Amino acid sequence: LEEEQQRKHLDQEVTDVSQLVEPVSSPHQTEGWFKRLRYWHYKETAEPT
Amino acid sequence: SRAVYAKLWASTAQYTQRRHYAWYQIWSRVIPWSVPWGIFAMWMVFPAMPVEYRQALTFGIWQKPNIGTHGPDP
Ligand SMILES: CCCCCCCCCCCCCCCCCC(=O)OC[C@H](COP(=O)([O-])OCC(O)COP(=O)([O-])OC[C@@H](COC(=O)CCCCCCCCCCCCCCCCC)OC(=O)CCCCCCCCCCCCCCCCC)OC(=O)CCCCCCCCCCCCCCCCC
Ligand SMILES: CCCCCCCCCCCCCCCCCC(=O)OC[C@H](COP(=O)([O-])OCC(O)COP(=O)([O-])OC[C@@H](COC(=O)CCCCCCCCCCCCCCCCC)OC(=O)CCCCCCCCCCCCCCCCC)OC(=O)CCCCCCCCCCCCCCCCC
């Protein structure tokens, strides 16, 4: 039902790169020396008890 | 009970330490193989060392071969 009652951005008409939707994710995340790529999602760290 | 479930969860908390105990057990069974391989190595490089050193590692037992040639000059 959510898929038939919500609107999709790809159904609107845009013409310029400046009008593209802005992501809700923030660019400020991973930090460190010589860390070239600055955005990630998943990791394999063990969960505690 | 929540108390029981907690103790079962914690039973496997020290995974990393138990793997280290595995390291010890296996390396104790393997390390004696260094003696056979060590004897053969010294056995191979023994003749390339000086005469003076060859008599030290054997406590004066080893000596030059006596085959009947290259004796003192009168
Ligand atoms: C008496 C003379 C003595 C002389 C000796 C020197 C004395 C110096 C005294 C200085 C005293 C005052 C300053 C103190 C600063 C202390 C900083 C500190 O400890 O950190 C605090 C604090 C630590 O907190 P933290 O939580 O760890 O934060 C760390 C950050 O998160 C970090 O992560 P982040 O995410 O925030 O940052 C992004 C990250 C990641 O960024 C990236 O990955 C992006 C990279 C983009 C690169 C794109 C390049 C494209 C262009 C390429 C061009 C072509 C090249 C190829 C072609 C080549 C052809 C040949 O960026 C970096 O990794 C930066 C890289 C910096 C490299 C600089 C290396 C310089 C080495 C100099 C030589 C040293 C000796 C070498 C060995 C010699 C032989 C034994 O750090 C900060 O807050 C940031 C400060 C960063 C400062 C960096 C610059 C310092 C410069 C100091 C002066 C040096 C002068 C040298 C010459 C002197 C001539 C006389
Ligand atoms: C019930 C059944 C009974 C049956 C009847 C009985 C059966 C038995 C009868 C046997 C009778 C003898 C038979 C003949 C055997 C000998 C003849 C012989 O065989 O000669 C070889 C024969 C000629 O021999 P040679 O070269 O003229 O011999 C010259 C000598 O070697 C001359 O060598 P060198 O002068 O250059 O060097 C000698 C030197 C060499 O010295 C060294 O290299 C090292 C010396 C320094 C050692 C420092 C050790 C420091 C640590 C000491 C620790 C002490 C602990 C004390 C603890 C006390 C506790 C209370 O040694 C010494 O100076 C004497 C040693 C005195 C020191 C005492 C220590 C000794 C070492 C002890 C080690 C540790 C042992 C215990 C270990 C376990 C416990 C920890 O060669 C041939 O016939 C070659 C034929 C061609 C073969 C072709 C092979 C195949 C080719 C194709 C290969 C490709 C295909 C692959 C095929 C693979 C096939 C598998």
Side-chain angles (χ1 to χ4, degrees):
Chain A
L1 303 177
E2 173 74 346
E3 284 290 357
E4 77 194 11
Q5 295 179 27
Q6 179 55 283
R7 293 186 289 112
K8 302 176 177 61
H9 289 302
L10 287 172
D11 285 331
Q12 322 307 137
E13 280 292 339
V14 295
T15 55
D16 184 60
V17 174
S18 306
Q19 302 168 352
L20 294 169
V21 68
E22 56 158 355
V24 68
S25 293
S26 187
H28 309 288
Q29 184 202 83
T30 289
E31 181 191 11
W33 296 100
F34 310 104
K35 284 194 186 173
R36 203 184 138 264
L37 297 188
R38 315 288 294 178
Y39 187 92
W40 306 82
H41 272 178
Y42 304 125
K43 47 184 170 186
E44 295 183 69
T45 304
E47 294 288 355
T49 305
Chain B
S1 182
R2 292 183 54 246
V4 169
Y5 281 120
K7 186 159 178 65
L8 300 183
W9 298 335
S11 67
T12 49
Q14 300 185 12
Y15 174 83
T16 298
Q17 290 69 33
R18 183 55 182 82
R19 289 292 300 184
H20 292 351
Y21 190 55
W23 291 2
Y24 164 76
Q25 293 191 60
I26 273 62
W27 273 109
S28 62
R29 303 204 288 266
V30 166
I31 189 63
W33 280 110
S34 73
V35 173
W37 282 93
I39 294 166
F40 194 75
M42 201 65 58
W43 196 4
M44 276 299 296
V45 306
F46 185 86
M49 295 195 299
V51 169
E52 287 69 13
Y53 299 173
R54 285 179 271 187
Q55 304 180 226
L57 298 171
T58 66
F59 306 117
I61 298 173
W62 185 91
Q63 293 293 353
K64 300 183 179 183
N66 181 12
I67 61 173
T69 60
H70 287 93
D73 191 326

Coordinates of all heavy atoms in Angstrom, one line a residue, chain B residues 30-62:
Chain B
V30 N 54.0 -29.0 17.6 CA 54.8 -28.8 16.3 C 56.2 -28.5 16.6 O 57.1 -28.9 15.8 CB 54.1 -27.8 15.5 CG1 55.0 -27.3 14.4 CG2 52.8 -28.3 14.9
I31 N 56.6 -27.8 17.6 CA 57.9 -27.2 17.8 C 59.0 -28.2 17.9 O 60.1 -27.9 17.6 CB 57.9 -26.2 19.0 CG1 59.2 -25.4 19.1 CG2 57.7 -26.9 20.3 CD1 59.4 -24.5 17.9
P32 N 58.7 -29.4 18.4 CA 59.9 -30.4 18.4 C 60.4 -30.8 17.1 O 61.6 -31.3 17.0 CB 59.2 -31.6 19.1 CG 58.1 -31.1 19.9 CD 57.5 -30.0 19.0
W33 N 59.7 -30.5 16.0 CA 60.2 -30.8 14.6 C 61.4 -29.9 14.3 O 62.1 -30.2 13.3 CB 59.1 -30.7 13.6 CG 58.2 -31.8 13.5 CD1 56.9 -31.9 13.8 CD2 58.5 -33.1 12.9 NE1 56.3 -33.1 13.6 CE2 57.3 -33.9 13.0 CE3 59.6 -33.7 12.4 CZ2 57.3 -35.2 12.6 CZ3 59.6 -35.0 12.0 CH2 58.4 -35.7 12.1
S34 N 61.7 -28.9 15.1 CA 62.9 -28.1 14.8 C 64.2 -28.8 15.1 O 65.2 -28.3 14.6 CB 62.8 -26.8 15.6 OG 63.0 -27.0 17.0
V35 N 64.2 -29.8 15.9 CA 65.4 -30.5 16.3 C 65.9 -31.4 15.1 O 67.1 -31.2 14.7 CB 65.2 -31.3 17.5 CG1 66.4 -32.2 17.8 CG2 64.9 -30.4 18.7
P36 N 65.1 -32.3 14.5 CA 65.6 -33.0 13.3 C 66.0 -32.1 12.2 O 67.1 -32.3 11.7 CB 64.3 -33.8 12.9 CG 63.6 -34.0 14.1 CD 63.8 -32.8 15.0
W37 N 65.3 -31.0 11.9 CA 65.6 -30.1 10.8 C 66.9 -29.3 11.2 O 67.6 -28.9 10.3 CB 64.5 -29.2 10.5 CG 63.4 -29.9 9.6 CD1 62.3 -30.5 10.1 CD2 63.4 -30.0 8.2 NE1 61.6 -31.0 9.0 CE2 62.2 -30.7 7.8 CE3 64.3 -29.6 7.2 CZ2 61.9 -31.0 6.5 CZ3 63.9 -29.8 5.9 CH2 62.8 -30.5 5.6
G38 N 67.1 -29.1 12.5 CA 68.3 -28.4 12.9 C 69.5 -29.2 12.9 O 70.6 -28.6 12.5
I39 N 69.4 -30.5 13.2 CA 70.6 -31.3 13.1 C 71.1 -31.4 11.6 O 72.3 -31.4 11.4 CB 70.3 -32.7 13.7 CG1 70.0 -32.6 15.2 CG2 71.5 -33.7 13.4 CD1 69.4 -33.9 15.8
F40 N 70.2 -31.6 10.7 CA 70.5 -31.7 9.3 C 71.2 -30.5 8.8 O 72.1 -30.5 7.9 CB 69.3 -32.1 8.5 CG 69.6 -32.6 7.1 CD1 70.1 -33.9 6.9 CD2 69.4 -31.8 6.0 CE1 70.4 -34.3 5.7 CE2 69.7 -32.3 4.7 CZ 70.2 -33.5 4.6
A41 N 70.7 -29.3 9.2 CA 71.3 -28.0 8.7 C 72.7 -27.9 9.1 O 73.6 -27.6 8.3 CB 70.5 -26.9 9.3
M42 N 73.0 -28.1 10.4 CA 74.4 -28.0 10.9 C 75.3 -29.1 10.2 O 76.4 -28.9 9.9 CB 74.5 -28.2 12.4 CG 75.7 -27.7 13.1 SD 75.9 -25.9 12.9 CE 74.4 -25.3 13.7
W43 N 74.7 -30.3 10.1 CA 75.4 -31.4 9.4 C 75.8 -31.0 8.0 O 76.8 -31.4 7.5 CB 74.4 -32.6 9.3 CG 75.1 -33.9 9.0 CD1 76.4 -34.2 8.8 CD2 74.4 -35.2 8.8 NE1 76.6 -35.5 8.5 CE2 75.4 -36.1 8.5 CE3 73.1 -35.6 8.9 CZ2 75.0 -37.5 8.3 CZ3 72.7 -36.9 8.7 CH2 73.7 -37.8 8.4
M44 N 75.0 -30.1 7.3 CA 75.3 -29.7 5.9 C 76.4 -28.6 5.9 O 77.2 -28.7 5.0 CB 74.1 -29.3 5.2 CG 73.2 -30.4 4.6 SD 74.1 -31.4 3.4 CE 74.4 -30.2 2.1
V45 N 76.4 -27.7 6.8 CA 77.3 -26.5 6.7 C 78.6 -26.8 7.5 O 79.5 -25.9 7.5 CB 76.6 -25.2 7.2 CG1 75.3 -25.0 6.5 CG2 76.4 -25.3 8.7
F46 N 78.7 -27.9 8.2 CA 79.9 -28.2 9.0 C 81.1 -28.2 8.1 O 82.1 -27.6 8.6 CB 79.7 -29.6 9.7 CG 80.8 -30.0 10.6 CD1 80.8 -29.5 11.9 CD2 81.8 -30.8 10.2 CE1 81.8 -29.9 12.8 CE2 82.8 -31.1 11.1 CZ 82.8 -30.7 12.3
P47 N 81.2 -28.8 7.0 CA 82.4 -28.9 6.2 C 82.9 -27.5 5.6 O 84.0 -27.4 5.1 CB 82.2 -29.9 5.1 CG 80.7 -29.9 5.0 CD 80.1 -29.6 6.3
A48 N 82.0 -26.5 5.6 CA 82.3 -25.2 5.0 C 82.9 -24.3 6.0 O 83.3 -23.2 5.7 CB 81.1 -24.6 4.4
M49 N 83.0 -24.7 7.3 CA 83.5 -23.8 8.3 C 85.0 -24.1 8.5 O 85.5 -25.1 8.1 CB 82.8 -24.1 9.6 CG 81.3 -23.6 9.6 SD 80.5 -23.5 11.2 CE 80.7 -25.2 11.8
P50 N 85.7 -23.2 9.2 CA 87.2 -23.4 9.4 C 87.4 -24.6 10.3 O 86.6 -25.1 11.0 CB 87.6 -22.1 10.1 CG 86.6 -21.1 9.7 CD 85.3 -21.8 9.6
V51 N 88.7 -25.1 10.2 CA 89.1 -26.2 11.0 C 89.0 -25.9 12.4 O 88.6 -26.7 13.2 CB 90.5 -26.6 10.5 CG1 91.1 -27.7 11.5 CG2 90.5 -27.2 9.1
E52 N 89.4 -24.7 12.8 CA 89.4 -24.3 14.2 C 88.0 -24.4 14.9 O 87.9 -24.8 16.0 CB 90.0 -22.9 14.4 CG 91.5 -22.9 14.2 CD 91.9 -23.1 12.8 OE1 91.0 -23.0 11.9 OE2 93.1 -23.3 12.5
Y53 N 87.0 -24.0 14.1 CA 85.7 -24.0 14.6 C 85.1 -25.5 14.7 O 84.3 -25.8 15.6 CB 84.7 -23.1 13.8 CG 85.1 -21.7 13.8 CD1 84.5 -20.8 12.9 CD2 86.1 -21.2 14.6 CE1 84.8 -19.4 12.9 CE2 86.5 -19.8 14.6 CZ 85.8 -19.0 13.7 OH 86.1 -17.6 13.7
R54 N 85.5 -26.3 13.7 CA 85.0 -27.7 13.7 C 85.5 -28.5 14.9 O 84.7 -29.4 15.3 CB 85.4 -28.4 12.4 CG 84.7 -27.9 11.2 CD 85.1 -28.6 9.9 NE 86.2 -27.9 9.2 CZ 86.7 -28.2 8.1 NH1 86.3 -29.2 7.4 NH2 87.7 -27.4 7.6
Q55 N 86.6 -28.1 15.4 CA 87.1 -28.8 16.6 C 86.5 -28.3 17.9 O 86.6 -29.0 19.0 CB 88.6 -28.7 16.7 CG 89.4 -29.2 15.5 CD 90.9 -29.0 15.7 OE1 91.6 -28.5 14.7 NE2 91.4 -29.4 16.8
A56 N 85.8 -27.2 17.9 CA 85.2 -26.6 19.1 C 83.8 -27.2 19.3 O 83.5 -27.5 20.5 CB 85.1 -25.1 19.0
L57 N 83.0 -27.2 18.3 CA 81.6 -27.8 18.4 C 81.6 -29.2 18.8 O 80.5 -29.7 19.2 CB 80.9 -27.6 17.1 CG 80.6 -26.2 16.6 CD1 80.1 -26.2 15.2 CD2 79.7 -25.4 17.6
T58 N 82.7 -30.0 18.7 CA 82.8 -31.4 19.0 C 83.6 -31.7 20.2 O 83.8 -32.9 20.5 CB 83.3 -32.2 17.8 OG1 84.7 -31.8 17.5 CG2 82.5 -31.8 16.5
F59 N 84.2 -30.7 20.9 CA 85.0 -30.9 22.1 C 86.3 -31.7 21.8 O 86.6 -32.7 22.5 CB 84.2 -31.6 23.2 CG 82.9 -30.9 23.5 CD1 81.7 -31.5 23.3 CD2 82.9 -29.6 24.0 CE1 80.5 -30.8 23.6 CE2 81.7 -28.9 24.3 CZ 80.5 -29.5 24.1
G60 N 86.9 -31.3 20.7 CA 88.2 -32.0 20.3 C 88.1 -33.4 19.7 O 89.1 -34.0 19.5
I61 N 86.8 -33.9 19.5 CA 86.7 -35.2 19.0 C 87.1 -35.2 17.5 O 87.9 -36.1 17.1 CB 85.2 -35.7 19.2 CG1 84.9 -35.8 20.7 CG2 85.0 -37.0 18.5 CD1 83.4 -36.1 21.0
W62 N 86.5 -34.3 16.7 CA 86.8 -34.3 15.3 C 88.2 -33.9 15.1 O 88.8 -33.0 15.8 CB 85.8 -33.3 14.6 CG 86.0 -33.3 13.1 CD1 85.3 -34.1 12.2 CD2 86.9 -32.5 12.3 NE1 85.7 -33.8 11.0 CE2 86.6 -32.9 11.0 CE3 87.8 -31.6 12.7 CZ2 87.3 -32.3 10.0 CZ3 88.5 -31.0 11.6 CH2 88.3 -31.3 10.3

